[PDB]
Amino acid sequence: WIQXITALAPQAPAPF
């Protein structure tokens, strides 16, 4: 669950 939010942490800035 911490690994899933780590992969998605650079997919807040990469779209936005």
Side-chain angles (χ1 to χ4, degrees):
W1 186 84
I2 57 150
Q3 216 70 9
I5 301 165
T6 301
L8 286 155
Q11 307 191 60
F16 299 120

Coordinates of all heavy atoms in Angstrom, one line a residue, unseen atoms left out:
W1 N 0.8 -1.2 0.0 CA 0.0 0.0 0.0 C 0.9 1.3 0.0 O 0.5 2.2 -0.8 CB -1.0 -0.1 1.2 CG -2.0 1.1 1.3 CD1 -3.3 1.1 0.6 CD2 -2.0 2.2 2.0 NE1 -4.0 2.3 0.9 CE2 -3.2 3.0 1.8 CE3 -1.0 2.7 2.9 CZ2 -3.4 4.2 2.4 CZ3 -1.2 3.9 3.5 CH2 -2.4 4.7 3.3
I2 N 1.9 1.4 0.8 CA 3.0 2.4 0.7 C 3.8 2.4 -0.7 O 4.1 3.4 -1.2 CB 4.0 2.5 1.9 CG1 4.7 1.2 2.3 CG2 3.3 3.2 3.1 CD1 6.1 1.4 2.9
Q3 N 4.1 1.2 -1.2 CA 4.7 1.1 -2.6 C 3.7 1.6 -3.8 O 4.3 2.3 -4.7 CB 5.1 -0.4 -2.9 CG 6.3 -0.6 -3.7 CD 7.7 -0.2 -3.0 OE1 7.7 0.1 -1.9 NE2 8.7 -0.2 -3.8
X4 N 2.4 1.3 -3.7 CA 1.4 1.9 -4.6 C 1.3 3.4 -4.6 O 1.4 4.1 -5.7
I5 N 1.2 4.1 -3.4 CA 1.2 5.6 -3.3 C 2.6 6.2 -3.6 O 2.7 7.3 -4.1 CB 0.6 6.0 -1.9 CG1 -0.8 5.6 -1.7 CG2 0.7 7.6 -1.7 CD1 -1.4 5.7 -0.2
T6 N 3.8 5.4 -3.5 CA 5.1 5.8 -4.0 C 5.2 5.8 -5.6 O 5.6 6.9 -6.1 CB 6.2 5.0 -3.3 OG1 6.2 5.3 -1.9 CG2 7.7 5.4 -3.7
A7 N 4.8 4.8 -6.3 CA 4.7 4.8 -7.8 C 3.7 5.9 -8.4 O 4.0 6.6 -9.4
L8 N 2.6 6.2 -7.7 CA 1.6 7.3 -8.0 C 2.0 8.7 -7.5 O 1.4 9.7 -8.0 CB 0.2 6.8 -7.5 CG -0.4 5.7 -8.4 CD1 -1.5 4.9 -7.6 CD2 -1.1 6.3 -9.7
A9 N 3.0 8.9 -6.6 CA 3.5 10.2 -6.1 C 4.1 11.1 -7.3 O 3.7 12.2 -7.5
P10 N 5.1 10.6 -8.2 CA 5.4 11.3 -9.5 C 4.2 11.4 -10.6 O 4.4 12.1 -11.6 CB 6.6 10.6 -10.0 CG 6.6 9.2 -9.4 CD 5.9 9.4 -8.0
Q11 N 3.1 10.7 -10.4 CA 1.9 10.9 -11.2 C 0.8 11.8 -10.7 O -0.3 11.9 -11.2 CB 1.2 9.5 -11.6 CG 2.2 8.5 -12.2 CD 1.4 7.2 -12.8 OE1 0.6 7.3 -13.7 NE2 1.7 6.0 -12.3
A12 N 1.1 12.6 -9.6 CA 0.5 14.0 -9.3 C 1.3 15.1 -10.3 O 0.6 15.7 -11.1
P13 N 2.6 15.4 -10.2 CA 3.3 16.3 -11.1 C 3.3 16.0 -12.6 O 3.2 17.0 -13.4 CB 4.7 16.5 -10.5 CG 4.9 15.4 -9.5 CD 3.6 14.7 -9.3
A14 N 3.6 14.7 -13.1 CA 3.6 14.4 -14.5 C 2.3 14.7 -15.3 O 2.4 15.4 -16.4
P15 N 1.0 14.4 -14.9 CA -0.2 15.1 -15.5 C -0.3 16.6 -15.1 O -1.0 17.3 -15.9 CB -1.3 14.2 -15.0 CG -0.9 13.6 -13.7 CD 0.7 13.6 -13.8
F16 N 0.1 17.1 -14.0 CA -0.2 18.5 -13.5 C 1.0 19.3 -13.1 O 1.9 19.5 -14.2 CB -1.2 18.3 -12.3 CG -2.5 17.6 -12.6 CD1 -2.9 16.5 -11.9 CD2 -3.4 18.1 -13.5 CE1 -4.1 15.8 -12.2 CE2 -4.6 17.4 -13.8 CZ -4.9 16.3 -13.2

